[PDB]
Amino acid sequence: ARQSAIAAAREARGTYRNGLVTPTAGVAPGMTQANLIALPRDWAYDFLLYAQRNPKACPILDVSDAGSPTTLLAEGSDLRTDIPMYRIWRDGKLAEEVSDATQAWAEHDDMVAFLIGCSFTFETPLQEAGIEVRHITDGCNVPMYRTNRACRPAGRLHGEMVVSMRPIPADRVAEASAISGRHGAPVHIGEPGRLGINDLSRPDFGDAVSIKPGEVPVFWACGVTPQAAVMASGVPFAITHSPGYMFITDVP
Amino acid sequence: ARQSAIAAAREARGTYRNGLVTPTAGVAPGMTQANLIALPRDWAYDFLLYAQRNPKACPILDVSDAGSPTTLLAEGSDLRTDIPMYRIWRDGKLAEEVSDATQAWAEHDDMVAFLIGCSFTFETPLQEAGIEVRHITDGCNVPMYRTNRACRPAGRLHGEMVVSMRPIPADRVAEASAISGRHGAPVHIGEPGRLGINDLSRPDFGDAVSIKPGEVPVFWACGVTPQAAVMASGVPFAITHSPGYMFITDVPD
Incomplete structure (x- = not known):
C-alpha cells in the first residue's frame, strides 16, 4: 500500500x-x-x-x-x-x-x-520486461563514471557529466533504451571509451560490476554530476x- | 520558408x-x-x-x-x-x-x-478552427489580468499569476482548451470573478476587448506574471x- x-x-x-x-x-x-x-x-x-x-x-x-x-x-x-x-x-x-x-x-x-x-x-519497468539490473542482482551500488562530456557552464561552475551504467544484453539494448526513454533516455550506448571511460572495472563512483561478454554497456546521466562540478x-x-x-x- | x-x-x-x-x-x-x-x-x-x-x-x-x-x-x-x-x-x-x-x-x-x-x-491552431483570436482581429494587445491565485513564494519574491484572456464561442470552448493543451492548458473558464477579476473591461495589461453576448472568457497563464511579483x-x-x-x-x- x-x-x-x-x-x-x-x-x-x-x-x-x-x-x-x-x-x-x-x-x-x-x-x-x-x-x-x-x-x-x-x-x-x-x-x-x-x-x-x-x-x-x-x-x-x-x-x-x-x-x-x-x-x-x-x-x-x-x-x-x-x-x-x-x-x-x-x-x-x-x-x-x-x-x-x-x-x-x-x-x-x-x-x-x-x-x-x-x-x-526506468529500473522498475526494465526488470519488469525481464532485463535485469546487474548491480541490483547483487548487493551493489551502481557503478558511475566521470565522462569527457562537458556540461553547459553557469557562473563559476563548469564540469563533466557523471553517468551510471548497467550492462544490457545485446538483443535487449534497443528496447532497454526505449523503455527508459518512455529525459530518461540513455546518453550513450556501447564503446566506453567514447565517453572518456578508460576501464569500466574502475568506476569513479559506486561499485564495479561484471559484464557478460554478450552484454553491452549502457549509460544514463545521474545526479552525482554536481559532485564532479564541485571538483x-x-x-x-x-x-x-x-x-x-x-x-x-x-x-x- | x-x-x-x-x-x-x-x-x-x-x-x-x-x-x-x-x-x-x-x-x-x-x-x-x-x-x-x-x-x-x-x-x-x-x-x-x-x-x-x-x-x-x-x-x-x-x-x-x-x-x-x-x-x-x-x-x-x-x-x-x-x-x-x-x-x-x-x-x-x-x-x-x-x-x-x-x-x-x-x-x-x-x-x-x-x-x-x-x-x-496555440493561437495558430485556434484560428485554424475558426475560433478567432479576438485581439488579433482588432488592433490591440491581449487583455491580461492579475488573479487571486498566488504563485509559490521564492526568497523575497511573491505575487499573483497574471493570465491572458481570449473570448471563445460557448459551443467551441471544449476544443479550444483541448487544442491549447496538446503550460498551454487554460487555467480558468467562466466567472471572471471567481479568478479575482472584477471588471473585464479593465485589464491590468494590454487593451481591453469586446466580449460578444455568447462568448465565455477563457484564461491562460501569461508570461507577464514576474512584473506582478515585481510590484x-x-x-x-x-x-x-x-x-x-x-x-x-x-x-x-
Missing part, C-alpha cells in the same frame, strides 16, 4: 537520523530517492543556473529556502541528519565523510539545499550525499 | 536597435517571441527560484550570464536595444518607459536577463519589456 511504503520511508531516514550508516539501495521499495547538494546561497545561484542549463544531469526535485533543511518531499524531515552519509567538500576537494551534517551545515546560515533526481525510475570548479564549500547513500523522500 | 522567417526576425530586431518603436504583434511570423525581465544578480537568484517553483507562469526560454546582454536565442542580438520598448522599474512601481534600456542596464554591471515564454503558440515584492530595480513590445527570437514556434 502507498501508506506502508511511506511508513518505511519515515522509518528508514528515522534510523539514519539516529546515526545508522547503510546504502539506501532498495531500502523503501517504490519510494523516490534523491541526490543532494547544499551550497551557500551565493554559490546556490551558480548551481540553480547550472541546473537550469543541464536539466538532464541535474533534474531538480526541490530546492529548500535559504534557511533549510526541510523539504516538501518529506514532511518533518531534516536534511542534515536523515541521509546515511554526507560528503563535505572544501575548496573543490572532498575533505571528509560524516553520518551527520548538522555541524558542517552550521558553518553557513544561508545554506541552500538542492534535492536532485527523477520520480520516474572541477573549486567550490569553497558544498555538502552532498555520498554516492549510494541517498535521501529517501516521501514521493512514490 | 527556409531561413526566411529568421531573416525577417533579424531585420525586425535591426529596426528596433535603430530606434524603431512599433507593436511586435504580427512581425516575423512563425518566430517565437519572448517576455523579458532583467535583474541584478542578487535578485536574479530570487526570480530564477521563482521560475523553478512556478513553471507554468514563468517558462524560461533563456537566461543570460550576469553582465551579458546576449542570448543564445538570437545570435548577434543585443537585449538592451533590440526590443522596441522597455519598462524600467524602481521600488516595485515602474519609473519609466524607454525605447533603449542601454542606460538603465549600466546601473548594474551584474544584470541577468530572463527571456520568458514558450515556443508552443508586490517591492523589487528595488528591474527592467522588462513593454506591453506588446517583445523580443523576437530566431527560435521558430
Whole structure:
C-alpha cells in the first residue's frame, strides 16, 4: 500500500537520523530517492543556473529556502541528519565523510539545499520486461563514471557529466533504451571509451560490476554530476550525499 | 520558408536597435517571441527560484550570464536595444518607459536577463478552427489580468499569476482548451470573478476587448506574471519589456 511504503520511508531516514550508516539501495521499495547538494546561497545561484542549463544531469526535485533543511518531499524531515552519509567538500576537494551534517551545515546560515533526481525510475519497468539490473542482482551500488562530456557552464561552475551504467544484453539494448526513454533516455550506448571511460572495472563512483561478454554497456546521466562540478570548479564549500547513500523522500 | 522567417526576425530586431518603436504583434511570423525581465544578480537568484517553483507562469526560454546582454536565442542580438520598448522599474512601481534600456542596464554591471515564454503558440491552431483570436482581429494587445491565485513564494519574491484572456464561442470552448493543451492548458473558464477579476473591461495589461453576448472568457497563464511579483515584492530595480513590445527570437514556434 502507498501508506506502508511511506511508513518505511519515515522509518528508514528515522534510523539514519539516529546515526545508522547503510546504502539506501532498495531500502523503501517504490519510494523516490534523491541526490543532494547544499551550497551557500551565493554559490546556490551558480548551481540553480547550472541546473537550469543541464536539466538532464541535474533534474531538480526541490530546492529548500535559504534557511533549510526541510523539504516538501518529506514532511518533518531534516536534511542534515536523515541521509546515511554526507560528503563535505572544501575548496573543490572532498575533505571528509560524516553520518551527520548538522555541524558542517552550521558553518553557513544561508545554506541552500538542492534535492536532485527523477520520480520516474526506468529500473522498475526494465526488470519488469525481464532485463535485469546487474548491480541490483547483487548487493551493489551502481557503478558511475566521470565522462569527457562537458556540461553547459553557469557562473563559476563548469564540469563533466557523471553517468551510471548497467550492462544490457545485446538483443535487449534497443528496447532497454526505449523503455527508459518512455529525459530518461540513455546518453550513450556501447564503446566506453567514447565517453572518456578508460576501464569500466574502475568506476569513479559506486561499485564495479561484471559484464557478460554478450552484454553491452549502457549509460544514463545521474545526479552525482554536481559532485564532479564541485571538483572541477573549486567550490569553497558544498555538502552532498555520498554516492549510494541517498535521501529517501516521501514521493512514490 | 527556409531561413526566411529568421531573416525577417533579424531585420525586425535591426529596426528596433535603430530606434524603431512599433507593436511586435504580427512581425516575423512563425518566430517565437519572448517576455523579458532583467535583474541584478542578487535578485536574479530570487526570480530564477521563482521560475523553478512556478513553471507554468514563468517558462524560461533563456537566461543570460550576469553582465551579458546576449542570448543564445538570437545570435548577434543585443537585449538592451533590440526590443522596441522597455519598462524600467524602481521600488516595485515602474519609473519609466524607454525605447533603449542601454542606460538603465549600466546601473548594474551584474544584470541577468530572463527571456520568458514558450515556443508552443496555440493561437495558430485556434484560428485554424475558426475560433478567432479576438485581439488579433482588432488592433490591440491581449487583455491580461492579475488573479487571486498566488504563485509559490521564492526568497523575497511573491505575487499573483497574471493570465491572458481570449473570448471563445460557448459551443467551441471544449476544443479550444483541448487544442491549447496538446503550460498551454487554460487555467480558468467562466466567472471572471471567481479568478479575482472584477471588471473585464479593465485589464491590468494590454487593451481591453469586446466580449460578444455568447462568448465565455477563457484564461491562460501569461508570461507577464514576474512584473506582478515585481510590484508586490517591492523589487528595488528591474527592467522588462513593454506591453506588446517583445523580443523576437530566431527560435521558430
